[PDB]
């Protein structure tokens, strides 16, 4: 009963960062051998666990969180980071344990005159707590007057597009990010690596 990483890393569509997609992984044998050939594999770093010893441990709760961001925003997806994505779109906890995987997907996501299907949040009243998702598209008030939906002065639409193009240099190109969060503790485990009894 092999673990279906295929539906996570080889998906035909990825979610925008403002509305990141999560699915639960359980009741499977998870070999991490298969996902080392998706790319040059630009980023792969783990917290609390060595990337080399994953095929030796067994986990209680595994979740895969996927989204698309700019290359120079990949650095914000880590514990203790701040900027824009970390604060308004996707926050990780300071005691996060798990692995962050990312690769350059320009050849899939870019378009001749800009891909505008990927959105991120620019404006919010307060910062997000770990693993929160803010979907609301309600108009943001930046002034002392109730603009009541009218995008006038001191009033903004919360979301903006990335507009990805083939001509962009690295850092402005789209990257696909998958975060695998682990729960390694005394609780009964369900997702083990490929070992014999």
């Amino acid at each position, epitope marked *: 009963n092999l673990c279906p990483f295929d539906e996570v890393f080889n998906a035909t569509r990825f979610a925008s960062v403002y509305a990141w997609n999560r699915k639960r992984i359980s009741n499977c044998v998870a070999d991490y051998s298969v996902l080392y050939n998706l790319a040059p594999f630009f980023t792969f770093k783990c917290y609390g666990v060595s990337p080399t010893k994953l095929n030796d441990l067994c986990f209680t709760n595994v979740y895969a969180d996927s989204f698309v961001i700019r290359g120079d925003e990949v650095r914000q997806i880590a514990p203790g980071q701040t900027g824009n994505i970390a604060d308004y779109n996707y926050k990780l906890p300071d005691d996060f344990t798990g692995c962050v995987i990312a690769w350059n997907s*320009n*050849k899939l996501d870019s378009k*001749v005159s800009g891909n505008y299907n990927y959105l991120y949040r620019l404006f919010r009243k307060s910062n997000l707590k770990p693993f929160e998702r803010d979907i609301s598209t309600e108009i943001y008030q930046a002034g002392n007057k109730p603009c009541n939906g009218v995008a006038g002065f001191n009033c903004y639409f919360p979301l903006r597009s990335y507009s990805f193009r083939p*001509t962009y240099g690295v850092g402005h190109q789209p990257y696909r990010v998958v975060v695998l969060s682990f729960e390694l503790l005394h609780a009964p485990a369900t997702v083990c690596g490929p070992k014999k009894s």
Partner: antibody
Framework: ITLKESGPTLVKPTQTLTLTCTFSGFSVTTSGVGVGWIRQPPGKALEYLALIYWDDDKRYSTSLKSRLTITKDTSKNQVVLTMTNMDPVDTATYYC???????????WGQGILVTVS | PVLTQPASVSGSPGQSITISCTATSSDVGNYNYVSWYQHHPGKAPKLMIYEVSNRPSGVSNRFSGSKSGNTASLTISGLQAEDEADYYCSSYTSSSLLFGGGTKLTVLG
């Protein structure tokens, strides 16, 4: 992977040009894959006209945007390009080709020659 | 935003020739998606090189390419009598894609 082009070979001034591209061997409903049109007037370089993506995004040449329209039908693998207000100078061989990012166009069709008179 | 090419390239059979394609602006950005086509009269254009230096399958190893600065070059080694074609370069710009002027290659013999 094949692409075939059909439509009127003879058009007259101020009329509307229409060309229909039939493709097989692949689907267009995949990420990073579209279909576009290129024309080549006699003795001249290739000119880009229009491009349609798998998600129905549409792109046009910056000088011909006001004249070109492109649509697709994925039930019978058709891509249709129309061009209004045909001028006598708009005589060229038209080509239908597959569009991807790492390689701008490939698997070009044989092309269809259209004369305006 | 015009790709510039030499009108014509000549050479003897068996030697190597170079067909260049130089950018005239910076609208091309990274200019890292340069494609080369071989066009024979009466035939559909064939892709020979893509992404600057990569070959498609079914393409002879006599065809290769590379960049320097903002100029791309197509190298044809072992020039054969069957290589007579109009060669075109293509790349991306800020809001569209462009083709070059076209180079006519003639093989002596």
């Amino acid at each position: 992977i094949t692409l075939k082009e059909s439509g009127p070979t003879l058009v007259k001034p101020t009329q509307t040009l229409t060309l229909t591209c039939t493709f097989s061997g692949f689907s267009v409903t995949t990420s990073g894959v579209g279909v576009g049109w290129i024309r080549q007037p006699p003795g001249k370089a290739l000119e880009y006209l229009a491009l349609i993506y798998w998600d129905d995004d549409k792109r046009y040449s910056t000088s011909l945007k006001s004249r070109l329209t492109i649509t697709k039908d994925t039930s019978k693998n058709q891509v249709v390009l129309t061009m209004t207000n045909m001028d006598p100078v708009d005589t060229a061989t038209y080509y239908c080709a597959r569009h991807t990012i790492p390689s701008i166009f490939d698997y070009w069709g044989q092309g269809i020659l259209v004369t305006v008179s | 935003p015009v790709l510039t090419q030499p009108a014509s390239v000549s050479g003897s059979p068996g030697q190597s020739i170079t067909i260049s394609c130089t950018a005239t602006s910076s609208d091309v950005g990274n200019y890292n998606y340069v494609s080369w086509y071989q066009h024979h009269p009466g035939k559909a254009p064939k892709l020979m090189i893509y992404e600057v230096s990569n070959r498609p399958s079914g393409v002879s190893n006599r065809f290769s390419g590379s960049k320097s600065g903002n100029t791309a070059s197509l190298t044809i080694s072992g020039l054969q009598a069957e290589d007579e074609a109009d060669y075109y370069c293509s790349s991306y710009t800020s809001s569209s894609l462009l083709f070059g002027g076209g180079t006519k290659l003639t093989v002596l013999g």
